[PDB]
Amino acid sequence: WRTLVGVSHTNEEVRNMAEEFEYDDEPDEQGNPKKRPGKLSDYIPGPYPN
Amino acid sequence: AYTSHLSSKTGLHFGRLSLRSLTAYAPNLMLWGGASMLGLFVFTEGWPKFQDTLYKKIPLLGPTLEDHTPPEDKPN
User: Fold this and answer.
1) Domain boundaries of chain B, sorted by first residue
2) Virtual CA dihedral for B16, B20, B22, B27, nearest 10 degrees?
3) Inter-chain touch A6–B73, beta carbons under 8 Å
């Protein structure tokens, strides 16, 4: 997502577009996994899991 | 007039060098120091710390080094 700023969209627009996808965050205090909204460092997600 | 001796005395030396040579080498050595410092200036110009300290304090050529792309468009 960070390559997309300064080229086609602005920084606020890419940060608003990255929130719509969920990504794997490292698990919390209990051990069960969590999900997080995406930030600018993560890659654009594919539509199929495998 | 008759001279039976010499009026001469040995100068100061360290075998390889003597002050006879160094009083002539000193202005060109200062010019070589200036040339080497200019070479350091040109070879270390992409350095950002030296860019903001020295290479932007230059009066007319200075602001050409800045690209103030707004903070609305940078990833970091």
Assistant:
1) 1-76
2) -150
3) yes
Task: Kindly report the three-state secondary structure assignment for every residue of chain B.
Answer: CCCCCCCCCCCCECCCCEHHHHHHHHHHHHHHHHHHHHHHHHHCCCCHHHHHHCCCCCCCCHHHCCCCCCCCCCCC
Structure-determination approach: cryo-EM
Chain A positions touching B67 (Cβ under 8 A) are none
What is the DSSP code (8-state) at residue A12?
A: H
- Say what the resolution is, in angstroms: 3.3
Measured between CA atoms, the residue of chain B closest to residue A3 is: B75
> Nearest-CA residue of chain B relative to A9?
B73
A8 SS3 class = coil
Q: Which 1-50 residues of chain A touch chain B by CB within 8 A?
A: 2-3, 5-6, 10-12, 40
